[PDB]
Amino acid sequence: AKLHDYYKDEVVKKLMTEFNYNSVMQVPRVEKITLNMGVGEAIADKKLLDNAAADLAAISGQKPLITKARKSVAGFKIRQGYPIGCKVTLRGERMWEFFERLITIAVPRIRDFRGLSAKSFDGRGNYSMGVREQIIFPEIDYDKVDRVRGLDITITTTAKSDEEGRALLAAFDFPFR
Amino acid sequence: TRNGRDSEAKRLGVKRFGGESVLAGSIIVRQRGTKFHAGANVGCGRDHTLFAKADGKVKFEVKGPKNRKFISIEAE
Amino acid sequence: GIREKIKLVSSAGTGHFYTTTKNKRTKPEKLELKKFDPVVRQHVIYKEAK
Amino acid sequence: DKKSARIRRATRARRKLQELGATRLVVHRTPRHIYAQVIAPNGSEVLVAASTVEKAIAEQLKYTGNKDAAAAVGKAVAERALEKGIKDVSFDRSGFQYHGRVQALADAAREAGLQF
RNA sequence: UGCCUGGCGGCCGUAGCGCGGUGGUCCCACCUGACCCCAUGCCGAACUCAGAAGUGAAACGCCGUAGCGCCGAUGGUAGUGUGGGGUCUCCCCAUGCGAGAGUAGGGAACUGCCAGGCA
RNA sequence: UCCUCCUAAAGAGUAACGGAGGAGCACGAAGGUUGGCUAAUCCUGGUCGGACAUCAGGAGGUUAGUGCAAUGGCAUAAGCCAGCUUGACUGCGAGCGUGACGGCGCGAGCAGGUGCGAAAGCAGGUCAUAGUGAUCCGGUGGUUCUGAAUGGAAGGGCCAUC
RNA sequence: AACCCGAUGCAAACUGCGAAUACCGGAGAAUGUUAUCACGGGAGACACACGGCGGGUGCUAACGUCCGUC
């Protein structure tokens, strides 16, 4: 709610001032924010998927989704339909709360945090990056950590260009590069 | 490699053509793949066999946005 | 071979029964199905499929 | 696409009703308004058409598209069908679900005296 | 008697793909909320319910753009049923029929019924 | 013994110790209803991750998948997921075609109990061709059908089945 | 050493194209000793070779061998 109101209040005005759009709806908006865990190590032991799902559910406001293998490839010893990775997609109030918590606490507290990577754009407008030691999130207790895991963040942005994506993120200010 | 075994060639294709006065229960055409589909007052079996559901004159016509060929029957 | 024939007798006293082919190696559980029995004129649960 | 999904989910029903050559009632539901039509056996003529856009039905409702409006239009189309002698006309879902205004209209017509 | 919008049909590329223009009075997308009808193999994402504050971002109706795809003659060409002939593993004579691609040309589809608005 | 493609000359069929082959399987769920979804491959960005484990966008528009070797077709998807499921029914079936024949494939609809779906509507198996095998003699339940004077029994026939 | 590019050749297991033949059903002037179909009795045969038309097969070596038609 807080981030939604912040977006509706002044982001459109600042984008109009700094870009000279035509319609109020010209402002790009992020459709969804997805966290992904492609651990790939679950083949050795099956008692990692449940722990990952529990951690994802605790981190987010809802349970995760286990993504089955797209294709059967012998290069990774994975068959068709194999539940190798997991994800959590957020849109709406849950997404706003998650992003608010992230920007407020998690990003500043990242170890050896200097800035993000602006070049990490898919060429269409979405913003995708990866962060290691997900323990950075305050929800997970440090003493309860079982194994070192990564995380992939992907924010889908309706903006058609990287410049438009940066303009939209200007509301978030893009803390550092 | 050590061949010499040929399977019996099951006969497929259209055996009853257009402008044929065919009663109910007749089979208009037997095609392995659905070369010809059914239309109005025409039925299709499990083995892609097209039959007339009532007496009449059969006809073939190109139909459908995908450029397919259908078989229909009209009152005679 | 791997499969074996199994009879399917109505739980009632009707002598009419069906037959099928099945393998118990992967499905040790019994059969639970209903089918129309002409003698009783109504669907009857079938058991003792062996 | 929003319309492509409905088209692909309703083409099966359209084909099934057309191949049988049976008159059908087709309903298209939108958030603002809902339209209902009765198609002739030939499949190229419409006997009865109704919608919330009509003033006669729009002058006694609060919101253009709702369960009450769906029921009202269903009753109106059922009454017109009974007057014209259009009994025993099948129904098509048009790719929608039987859990909202579509099912409300269907139930209203069934109570009014249409079987489908 | 005309223009615009929505729905149902005759053919699926002269019906199409890409670019520009144009449109919210009738209708549609999104735009507001959903503890409730409905449901997510998590998410109002999809679908559904209650609402109408903005405007065509995106989609969509129509016109131009002949940039790409397609059709498309006339004949030429390969062939072929007949009888004959030759230098016969292949060709010619008279006759009926007849390719594909390509060439001139076209194209921003045409058309039937119902509902609403604007004159 | 059987099945696919060309040989095989545009109805069908068509031989040769010709060219490539596969089948003796399996699902009571991998079939049906209703609803929902729609591949391979390439480019772009990223932590283990590299040519491909997963994620987001675009191109692509079925070459993916459609259990087997092969065939044509499947977008209305016959391809994938969710609730129920036994129509993997009962006795019929005018008619159509194939073979010399035994035999073989399709089939709307009829009376009953029905499964699914609000209804319309589908369901007599697996998208379809190979997973096949008789005759004689014997096993299982009934059928007092018959029963070498009668009561019986013994013995013989139909069905589902080794 | 995969995919891909610049090419290279081919097609029986390719047809976004596609004949000429040939087979089939409905109408019809003309003609054939009904030349068409069904039923019953009796057969013979169930080893073919050559030419033409498009081919397989062998190394066109043959009057080798097998296919659809006169």
PDB file of C-alpha atoms (C1' of nucleotides) in Angstrom, chain G residues 24-52:
ATOM      1  C1'   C G  24     -15.584 -44.713 -60.866  1.00  0.00           C
ATOM      2  C1'   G G  25     -20.961 -42.774 -60.577  1.00  0.00           C
ATOM      3  C1'   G G  26     -25.816 -39.494 -63.043  1.00  0.00           C
ATOM      4  C1'   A G  27     -28.119 -37.726 -68.091  1.00  0.00           C
ATOM      5  C1'   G G  28     -27.914 -38.647 -73.367  1.00  0.00           C
ATOM      6  C1'   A G  29     -28.167 -39.240 -79.925  1.00  0.00           C
ATOM      7  C1'   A G  30     -25.948 -43.349 -82.217  1.00  0.00           C
ATOM      8  C1'   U G  31     -24.693 -49.012 -82.615  1.00  0.00           C
ATOM      9  C1'   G G  32     -23.391 -54.397 -80.981  1.00  0.00           C
ATOM     10  C1'   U G  33     -27.392 -61.707 -82.507  1.00  0.00           C
ATOM     11  C1'   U G  34     -28.104 -59.165 -74.472  1.00  0.00           C
ATOM     12  C1'   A G  35     -22.377 -58.570 -76.161  1.00  0.00           C
ATOM     13  C1'   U G  36     -24.554 -57.320 -68.747  1.00  0.00           C
ATOM     14  C1'   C G  37     -26.070 -60.032 -63.907  1.00  0.00           C
ATOM     15  C1'   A G  38     -28.069 -64.399 -61.137  1.00  0.00           C
ATOM     16  C1'   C G  39     -28.983 -69.918 -60.602  1.00  0.00           C
ATOM     17  C1'   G G  40     -27.664 -75.483 -61.669  1.00  0.00           C
ATOM     18  C1'   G G  41     -24.292 -79.496 -64.376  1.00  0.00           C
ATOM     19  C1'   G G  42     -19.530 -80.305 -66.697  1.00  0.00           C
ATOM     20  C1'   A G  43     -14.602 -78.706 -67.820  1.00  0.00           C
ATOM     21  C1'   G G  44      -9.684 -77.592 -68.630  1.00  0.00           C
ATOM     22  C1'   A G  45      -5.843 -75.086 -66.229  1.00  0.00           C
ATOM     23  C1'   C G  46      -3.398 -73.549 -61.465  1.00  0.00           C
ATOM     24  C1'   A G  47       5.121 -74.732 -65.284  1.00  0.00           C
ATOM     25  C1'   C G  48       4.169 -69.967 -69.959  1.00  0.00           C
ATOM     26  C1'   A G  49       8.279 -67.371 -73.942  1.00  0.00           C
ATOM     27  C1'   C G  50       8.992 -63.013 -77.154  1.00  0.00           C
ATOM     28  C1'   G G  51       8.213 -57.529 -78.979  1.00  0.00           C
ATOM     29  C1'   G G  52       6.327 -52.525 -77.332  1.00  0.00           C
TER      30        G G  52
END
